[PDB]
Structures are given as C-alpha cells and as structure tokens.
Amino acid sequence: XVQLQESGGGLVQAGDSLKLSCEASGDSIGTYVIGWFRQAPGKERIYLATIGRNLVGPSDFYTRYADSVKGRFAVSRDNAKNTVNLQMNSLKPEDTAVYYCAAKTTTWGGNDPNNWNYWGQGTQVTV
Ligand SMILES: Nc1nc(N)nc(Nc2cc(S(=O)(=O)O)cc3cc(S(=O)(=O)O)c(/N=N/c4ccccc4S(=O)(=O)O)c(O)c23)n1
C-alpha cells in the first residue's frame, strides 16, 4: 500500500508547459507502476500515461502514452525522491481538468482506472 499526492497544478496560460509531481508515502514508489489520469467536471477519469517499475533498455523505464498526449506529455520516474513526474507541454483550454496519479503493481490494464489500486487526491489544472 502507498499514499500518493499530486502537486504542481493550478492556473496556467495556454501555450505554456506545466510539470506535475506525484509523491509516494508509506512505501517505495519504485515498487509501483505509476499512471496519470485527468478528469473533466462530471466525466470519468481518462488515462494519460504509464511509467513502469522496470527498464526496457539501459536507461529508460517502460512508458506508454494515450494517443491524445503522446509527444506532448512526458512521464519520468525519480525513485530516489519517491516521486514520478509528468511534463505537460503546449497546454490549452482543453487540458483544463483535475489530474491524478495512481499506482498498481500489475503489468496490464492501465487504461481502465478501475485497475489501479491507490490514487492521489488530485490536482486541478486550469488554463
Ligand atoms: N520490458 C518490457 N517489455 C515489453 N514488451 N512490455 C513491457 N510492459 C510493461 C512493463 C511494466 S514494468 O513494471 O516492468 O515496468 C509495466 C507495464 C505496465 C503496463 S499498464 O497496463 O499499466 O499500462 C503495460 N501495458 N501495456 C499496454 C497496455 C495497453 C495496450 C498496449 C500495451 S503494450 O504492451 O505496451 O503494447 C506494460 O506493457 C508494462 N515491459
């Protein structure tokens, strides 16, 4: 079990970038696959990206992005600081929503929010 907390959100100007952070407590974030989601008022949480626990090469961790943000958002992992980040670029009014980070240990089902075990409270992002 791990507790997650997002930070770095808030009012942002369209065209600019924003770096969101997800900090873990109670356990090592390195033991969990971390995912990012976003939710518009009244809608469901939609999958954004995944960063795996392990590598796919000498330096890179496994990563995956929804087509909606592939190439525009970048997920990264900093286990030493028990944190995982999400660099969001060229933000626009369409990106306004509460962003969440979640965790699980499985290697499948990232798209469905119901497959994730723990969630942060979320951070509002307004552009
Ligand atoms: N090293 C390695 N090599 C290959 N081929 N694949 C992996 N996959 C993976 C390794 C690890 S890890 O812990 O070692 O880092 C985590 C993973 C987490 C998820 S997710 O469901 O949470 O998004 C995942 N989903 N994929 C998909 C989900 C939906 C559609 C397509 C994929 S795909 O397999 O990438 O193509 C993985 O495959 C993972 N890892």
Q: What is the tally of structural domains in the chain?
A: 1
Name the residue with the closest Cα to ligand 1, atom 38: 107
Neighbouring C-beta atoms of residue 51, cutoff 10 Å: 25
What's the reported resolution, in angstroms, to a tenth?
2.0
Which approach determined this entry? X-ray
- For residue 90, the CA-to-ligand 1 centroid distance in Å is 27
CATH of the domain at 48: 2.60.40.10
| Structural domain boundaries, residue 17 | 2-127
Cα–Cα dist 108/103, whole Å:
12
- Is any atom of ligand 1 closer than 6 Å to the C-beta of 107? yes
Place of tokens 């969440």: 100
Ligand 1 atom nearest 33 alpha carbon: 13
Cα–Cα dist 97/9, whole Å:
10
Strands in 73-78's sheet, in edge-to-edge order, are 3-7, 18-25, 83-88, 73-78
Output the CA angle 87-122-39, nearest 5 degrees: 80
- Let me know if 104 is exposed, middle or buried by CB neighbors in 10 A (0-12, 13-18, 19+): middle
- Identify residue 109 by its one-letter amino acid code: G
Cα–Cα dist 1/117, whole Å:
8
Handedness of CA 23, 28, 32, 33 (dihedral sign): positive
